[PDB]
Amino acid sequence: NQSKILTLQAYDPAKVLVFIGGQRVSGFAADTKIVITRNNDNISVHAGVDGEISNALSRDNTGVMTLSLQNTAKWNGYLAQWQRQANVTGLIYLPVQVEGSQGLSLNTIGWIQKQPDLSYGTEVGQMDWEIGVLDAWLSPDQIQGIAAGITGLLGL
Amino acid sequence: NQSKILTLQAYDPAKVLVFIGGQRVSGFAADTKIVITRNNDNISVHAGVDGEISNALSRDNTGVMTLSLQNTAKWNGYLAQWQRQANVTGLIYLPVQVEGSQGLSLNTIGWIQKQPDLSYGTEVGQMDWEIGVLDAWLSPDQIQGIAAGITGLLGL
Amino acid sequence: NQSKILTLQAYDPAKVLVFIGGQRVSGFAADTKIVITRNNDNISVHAGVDGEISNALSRDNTGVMTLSLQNTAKWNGYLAQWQRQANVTGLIYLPVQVEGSQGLSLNTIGWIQKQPDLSYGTEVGQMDWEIGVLDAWLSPDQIQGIAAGITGLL
Amino acid sequence: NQSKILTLQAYDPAKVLVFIGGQRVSGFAADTKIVITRNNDNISVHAGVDGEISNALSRDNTGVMTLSLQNTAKWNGYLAQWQRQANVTGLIYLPVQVEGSQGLSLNTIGWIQKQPDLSYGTEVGQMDWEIGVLDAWLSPDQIQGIAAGITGLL
Amino acid sequence: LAQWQRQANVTGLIYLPVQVEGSQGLSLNTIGWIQKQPDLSYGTEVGQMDWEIGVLDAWLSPDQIQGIAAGITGLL
Amino acid sequence: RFSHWVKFRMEESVFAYMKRRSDMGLSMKMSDEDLPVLKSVLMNNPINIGIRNGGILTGYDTENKVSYDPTIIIPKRANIPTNDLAARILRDVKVELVYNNSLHYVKIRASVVLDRPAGQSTNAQTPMSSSAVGV
Amino acid sequence: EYQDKVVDVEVSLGTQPITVGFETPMFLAMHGNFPERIRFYVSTAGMVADGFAVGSPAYQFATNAFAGNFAPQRVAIGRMSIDSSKVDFTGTTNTEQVVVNITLVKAVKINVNTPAQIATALADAVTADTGKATAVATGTYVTVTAVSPNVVSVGKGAGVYKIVNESSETVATVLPSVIAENHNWYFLATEARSDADIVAAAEFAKANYKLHIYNSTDVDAYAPENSAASVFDTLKSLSYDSLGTSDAGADVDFTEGSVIGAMAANDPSYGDSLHLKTMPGMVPFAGSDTQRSNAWSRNANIYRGLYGGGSYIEGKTSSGQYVDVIRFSHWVKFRMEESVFAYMKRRSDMGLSMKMSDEDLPVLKSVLMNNPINIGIRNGGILTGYDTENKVSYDPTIIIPKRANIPTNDLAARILRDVKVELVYNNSLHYVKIRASVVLDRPAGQSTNAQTPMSSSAVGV
Amino acid sequence: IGAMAANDPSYGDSLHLKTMPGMVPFAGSDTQRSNAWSRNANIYRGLYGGGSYIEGKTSSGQYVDVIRFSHWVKFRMEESVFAYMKRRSDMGLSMKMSDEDLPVLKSVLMNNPINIGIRNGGILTGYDTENKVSY
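Predict the joint structure of the above. Result:
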């Protein structure tokens, strides 16, 4: 076969929308906006004494989301104030939504995990917020023609 | 001796066919399509107290298969939907086949092990799916003149 | 042995038409007009210590076509407006076709990759727009003859 | 086919006005006058092994504009004083607008990035102040015509 | 060469014989393949394109010259 | 059905391109500088859509030793009869396609062994492809 | 005209349509399908539309001609008046005979025993089938004849037999008439394959600069050299030039078309020959190996199969000269007449007709060197350079006389003479010999001499 | 014949020690075996339980594999040259006896008969230090 264009419109980093609490977030830095990862694998395998393989689904779905920002963005102050308020009162849970472009998306409830480290140097620094999320299953959503494809897979 | 061409026709990456569930997979990325590896060695050795060596064959044959895809491929959505369905109901086992070109091939039953991590950056990212497979013994199959060669080996 | 003329028709640069999006491009600069290059080698070779060698076929045909235009051509404004529109909306792919006079041709889908620098000086300068193409295989459609089947003692 | 003149008006370097902070700049050196370049490619391409290709749009438009001036121009002292004042106080952003004669234009906000070397010799030397711009998109405002909608068979 | 490249790509057979005969110099005879395609420039003058052909073995052979002194030479 | 789809969606693309040119005032003209453009138009709407979806075959065949790539030919101004210039008609445009067949019937030849899988000769030599005697 | 659609698309199936310069063959058949004596056809389907029956000699010739690798896209058909026709069953057959037959479009059916019974059975079905055609069996064959001025055409298929048309018009007298209507044909083939008819055509073609081709089933072709009872022997004695080849189907398939199909588009300027060329439709020669030797001395070419394929071996003509040389001579003649003639007309139509003077005659060197000569050199058909043994050069020479050297009589007649030209032909390769050697173990050490080999002995006086 | 029909001569493989399904071990004494050997009359002798052909020598004393090798070289050397000539003539560009085309035969001969005989080891190559002659 010959070459083929995977999509019709190009992936645009500015088209990726990040919402925390209900407000869009601006002030990203460097060449990595967000990184979404899980904490544990989906299935753990165990060997047997006579060749049998037993698989067990995992029931933990927490994950981490690293947000990279410049230290000149007001969202740094927003997050710091939220952290102080949460420590004082107790409310720590806020909604988190990420609308990807030509890619998977996320919609769950998150919290602030670890405060980054400042570094005042010659250039402008970078702060990386770890935001933990309850459910970390990515959703096809915008991508079309998925319902038909799912029923196409065979298995026994 | 002089130089020699190992084969007659060149190895072609597009000629390698990957089937999951019964559909060919398209959307590979970078410079590595698939990586097939085992989890344990085939034989474990033990030393003795007077020079004897005892060898024990392994009875576990599970392995891993890393699938590298762009985050603009629909198979990402297919796999995500399959993962959600498997979590809801319980069916996780689907057939996996890889037909190599001028190389070893695979034919077994696999499952989804760990979901990769998204990374929205300046360039187009890469997602690596770990697919675990029951049996990971590679088969010569297409390669001819193997049955005769096997009976040629001596040993005692 | 006597010297032989290769082609009965001279190579006329004005017959090398460039079509982007269905419109003919005019206003090319001096010296070169079109430069077409690939990005990676067609066949890679894995040399062995003993002597066995194996080759692999490349599945990537991305290339870069360079267009040189004068500062006073309207096509510079055309390309700038197209760049802005593609940026705001998202559709960035348009057809590209090049017809050779007495040489190879090209017909694929291209996009604007890099914008050129703009210098202002005593003389009229030159700006080289860099256009990328999906596939960079040159096609011998204009030449008549089928000898590929005849050739080859493999 | 007959040769055709591109533009009915000659390219006059004196019509390429440079405005920094609202004042016209005078005292340019010989050879080139203005050099405008971007920093990164407009579109990046991710080539795949099988053949699928995907592209991404760059969201960074930082560029560098080079101004060449003679050692005897007052604008060198102007720029030095502005550099010192911006250093002591902190405000470093001023508007920059460039109007082309028969070419593209530019209008963004710029700042002084690098100071040039100062040589003293037998002849009068040249100093190239490096000015950075927020966005380096060239604008075809002066040229009249709307064919971007007409072009494009995507 | 372009047609051969396309055909070798679609089918798979990429090896063809290559033989070079020198006038008063060394020669070469091995099996070769097309490795890299050249750039295509269009300008005021007729340009040049340099096809890069790879060879299995690059040993030059002195077959045309007559004389056997390799045995004579050598005080090793 | 395929033949009708090719006809309906091939004249439409050409018609659409002509209309766009006339709306701008720059209507198409029968000259060597513009006729070649039709290759890009035809390759765009009808053809490339038919190649992604697999309807149209491509590649090289080793039995016929003939390629399957689509071809397009366009007349030059020197071959148009003077009458057609008066009537403003262009003809003899030629295209070539190859259709891809589906699968309908399949046959299997199973075999069940009882005592031992059939043995093979120990001839480990590469199998010769032709007989030396040819007269 | 009115066009209902701005764009119209014709879609067909099966293949895409195939125009080059070529030399048409002419086949002199026996029929009455038109009053003309020559007509051009572009496809077999055109023939049947004109009432020609499938499997008829004219149809079989055309289908083979169009199947060659160098096939022409237009054939020509002669016409001789039919007196009757025959279907001969002097050969065993054990399957239904589908004898196609057309009047003014049916297919007679026969079942099979002995030839006498089947021949009689066919005649029975022809009658009471259409009482305006004649059919009568006689011993071992059936004669078919038209009772009225009604076109009748007998075909062929599914059987083992041959069709033998007959006519009262001799070939020697018909040919002067067909050439009158049209002369745009180069190859000459004849259906009437009698010994006298073939010789008559050969004499005619030689005097008209046509090329004559004929197949023959004669067993005497490969008979012992002493037996000069074949047509090939007669032509060899007469020193005629015609390309003949022995073939078993020469009277059932008319394989002349296959031979022509490999020459029509082959321009002589390349010096290529008929050696090893493939004829699509002929059958390999079977006669032992000595029989092959006899045919070769007869100048009777054969179709021989080697290494799975079929190969035509040597195109020697009746006189012994290779065919490629003969075609080159005709190519040289034709392309020099047109070139000089075409130049005079370009000058006669401008009012400035060419005149006999030393300031105008020399220009011919630029004309002759341009069209005929230069093409040959480019295509490799004409040798050039130097000869290291005879010490002569091969470059073509052209000599033109001077006005002072022209007799007074010629100036009155306005005709120039004594223009001389020289050329060298380039010969293809037909046969090759090899002397291989094999060494078993450790050949002895070679001589250690390391001097330049002296090329001549000192003592010579 | 069952032990030679599919045996490719290019390997230089001898007929020595090959099994002959269907024959019976030779029952002669030690002296008889010697008498037959000098006669060039091969025998099928059983050793260590199995059966094995012996020495494959021909009537004139030459080893059979050498005889087979020579025929293979002849048959498959003229064929390659003949095949190349035919391809040229089918294109109309038949070979011509000139210095510009005769040299091509080196590539043809090195292709089919020779290189096949070097991969399989039938044809020796390299340098010999006793004769001081290359192979």
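The interface with chain D takes residues 13-14, 26-33, 70, 72-73, 122-124 of chain B (CB under 8 Å).
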